[PDB]
Amino acid sequence: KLNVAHGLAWSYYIGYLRLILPGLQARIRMFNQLHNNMLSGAGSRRLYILFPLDCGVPDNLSVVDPNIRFRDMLPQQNIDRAGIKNRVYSNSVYEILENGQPAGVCILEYATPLQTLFAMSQDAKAGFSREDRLEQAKLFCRTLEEILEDVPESRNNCRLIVYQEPTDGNSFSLSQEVLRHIRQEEK
Amino acid sequence: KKLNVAHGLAWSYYIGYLRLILPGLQARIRMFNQLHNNMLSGAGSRRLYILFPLDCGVPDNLSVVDPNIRFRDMLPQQNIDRAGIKNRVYSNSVYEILENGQPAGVCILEYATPLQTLFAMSQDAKAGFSREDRLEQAKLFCRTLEEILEDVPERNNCRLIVYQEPTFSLSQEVLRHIRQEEK
Numbered sequence: 317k318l319n320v321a322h323g324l325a326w327s328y329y330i331g332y333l334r335l336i337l338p339g340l341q342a343r344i345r346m347f348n349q350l351h352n353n354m355l356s357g358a359g360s361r362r363l364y365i366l367f368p369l370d371c372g373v374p375d376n377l378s379v380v381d382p383n384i385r386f387r388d389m390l391p392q393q394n395i396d397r398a399g400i401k402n403r404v405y406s407n408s409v410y411e412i413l414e415n416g417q418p419a420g421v422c423i424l425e426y427a428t429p430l431q432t433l434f435a436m437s438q439d440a441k442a443g444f445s446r447e448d449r450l451e452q453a454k455l456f457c458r459t460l461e462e463i464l465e466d467v468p469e470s471r472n473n474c475r476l477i478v479y480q481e482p483t484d485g486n487s488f489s490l491s492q493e494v495l496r497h498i499r500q501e502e503k
Numbered sequence: 504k505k506l507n508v509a510h511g512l513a514w515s516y517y518i519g520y521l522r523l524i525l526p527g528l529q530a531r532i533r534m535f536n537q538l539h540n541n542m543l544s545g546a547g548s549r550r551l552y553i554l555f556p557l558d559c560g561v562p563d564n565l566s567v568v569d570p571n572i573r574f575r576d577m578l579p580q581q582n583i584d585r586a587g588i589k590n591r592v593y594s595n596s597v598y599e600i601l602e603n604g605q606p607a608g609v610c611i612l613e614y615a616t617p618l619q620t621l622f623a624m625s626q627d628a629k630a631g632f633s634r635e636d637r638l639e640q641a642k643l644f645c646r647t648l649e650e651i652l653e654d655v656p657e658r659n660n661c662r663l664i665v666y667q668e669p670t671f672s673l674s675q676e677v678l679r680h681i682r683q684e685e686k
């Protein structure tokens with residue numbers, strides 16, 4: 317009775333997070349010496365994954381919020397493990413503004429399986445309603461969170477940021493949500 | 504409706520890897536032919552082969568899996584910046600396949616990564632499943648993928664080699680496929 321969301325969560329963990337998280341702190345260490353310690357404390361150490369529950373496709377990190385500003389690429393990560401033979405990965409550091417002030421800095425990215433989930437909704441043969449897509453998106457999140465909890469070392473370096481985007485609201489600030497999560501990790 | 508983990512995996516493996524690696528594929532081959540005397544001269548040598556062992560096994564590392572199958576060199580590195588992925592480099596490996604202790608052919612060879620996720624999913628205590636359930640999914644993953652690539656002829660860049668263990672050699676199994684595709 318396992319469904320599409322379940323396979324997406326597992327695959328993303330085994331297929332991406334597994335490869336990306338263990339080298340994370342070292343990658344950050346190098347960055348801080350290199351960049352005068354932007355990635356200052358907890359809340360800067362984690363890899364933040366954006367998961368918009370959206371009727372539509374989310375905006376690029378470059379455009380989505382003026383208060384979200386690309387600062388620097390993290391050092392590259394080299395992968396020669398398992399199925400993956402000599403693959404190079406990268407992560408971006410963003411400055412987060414609040415009230416026109418630098419309010420946070422962190423490593424931020426969308427969850428790639430969104431693209432896929434999306435494509436599966438559009439496909440004519442087995443396409444499923446926006447309601448059905450969201451159903452699957454919600455579950456993928458729960459399932460992925462449930463995975464991460466089991467594995468604390470992977471879990472330490474990683475946070476899921478899932479939020480509803482109002483299609484029709486005057487204001488949603490991605491920056492505020494991120495700050496909200498970064499600060500919420502008081503502990 | 505009736506969708507399950509295999510479908511999910513198929514689309515992800517296409518949208519997440521195949522879609523990124525297939526389009527640049529032919530340009531990559533040309534440089535290599537230029538790099539090493541037109542080694543991948545024909546069809547069957549110009550396509551990407553995704554190794555899919557139905558018996559999960561290991562699945563044994565290609566460098567170690569068979570003597571007749573041996574690593575020759577990398578295809579030229581592929582750079583990706585499209586979609587949600589940015590600033591990534593992808594690597595593919597060329598293996599010459601010995602026959603009678605002699606090279607019958609050469610090609611680009613790799614195992615299907617979703618196999619690892621399928622195996623991992625089985626081990627989880629909650630909702631974890633038998634090999635038989637795992638087997639059905641690995642299969643369902645094949646057919647599901649299969650349908651998708653047909654829908655994109657844009658296909659002739661890659662094929663699947665799926666095989667169970669002797670009820671046997673990989674080299675002879677790969678060769679069967681590379682030999683079969685006459686046109």
Ligand SMILES: O=C(O)Cn1c2ccccc2c(=O)c2ccccc21
Binds near residue numbers: 432
């Ligand atoms: O993000 C990746 O590194 C590769 N990758 C995935 C890996 C696992 C599970 C799903 C996906 C996925 O849907 C996906 C979609 C678009 C691009 C890359 C993707």
Ligand SMILES: O=C(O)Cn1c2ccccc2c(=O)c2ccccc21
Binds near residue numbers: 512517519616621
């Ligand atoms: O093959 C990849 O590039 C990444 N990748 C995937 C991409 C898409 C869909 C599934 C998987 C997957 O299960 C997987 C499993 C282990 C390692 C990498 C993996």
